[PDB]
Write a protein that binds this ligand. Structure first.
Ligand code: NAG
Ligand code: NAG
Ligand code: NA
Lengths: 105, 105
């Protein structure tokens, strides 16, 4: 079944930098999406309106990491990697929540 | 900018019945999506992967209410209607949370 090969971890970073929240999925059947404070960022890598977020990894590798750049204070939140159910009855999955902390020097 | 003309409220319903959670957005610019216990259900009206759920209403009335039939005990959860940011900076919005309570006959 579909499952995480890698899940995001708590991170602390400095404003202005790039951050990568890791998410790798094996045997992905459902549609994938990140939540930020439980707000859905978009499925199928389509993050319209979030000009500083992207998901440039490849499907083959199951790379669905979230990149953020440049980091801003508003990005200080809790993030989760989500995969919806498959068309064949495959259940969806949810990664641990990762707390992204933003510092200012 | 985009705003809610209707938000979902708490409902109690019995297994087997139809339940529609209302969501209406005027001047909608972003992509709308429901969450179920903070899990994004999808950004298309058909909501693939959730075989008993769909989003009903006309785009011209910004009606994207969450239609559930037949109701199952699995549907007992908290629901939110969300609209993502627009392509021109317009900020996303989030409805109140509606608690759906499902009873057995
Ligand atoms: C992503 O969503 C936007 C907003 O609806 C749409 O205009 C665009 O075509 C989509 N991008 C892709 C590659 O599907
Ligand atoms: C659901 O809607 C999307 C967008 O219109 C479409 O790509 C997809 O094929 C639809 N699903 C079915 C089963 O028709
Ligand atoms: Na569906």
């Amino acid at each position: 079944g579909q499952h995480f090969a890698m899940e995001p971890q708590d991170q602390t970073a400095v404003v202005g930098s790039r951050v990568t929240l890791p998410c790798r999925v094996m045997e992905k059947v459902g549609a994938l999406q990140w939540t930020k404070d439980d707000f859905g960022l978009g499925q199928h890598r389509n993050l319209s309106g979030f000009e500083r977020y992207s998901m440039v990894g490849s499907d083959e590798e199951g790379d669905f990491s979230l990149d953020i750049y440049p980091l801003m204070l508003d990005d200080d939140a809790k993030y989760q990697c989500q995969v919806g159910p498959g068309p064949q009855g495959e259940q969806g999955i949810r990664s641990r929540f990762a707390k992204l902390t933003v510092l200012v020097p």
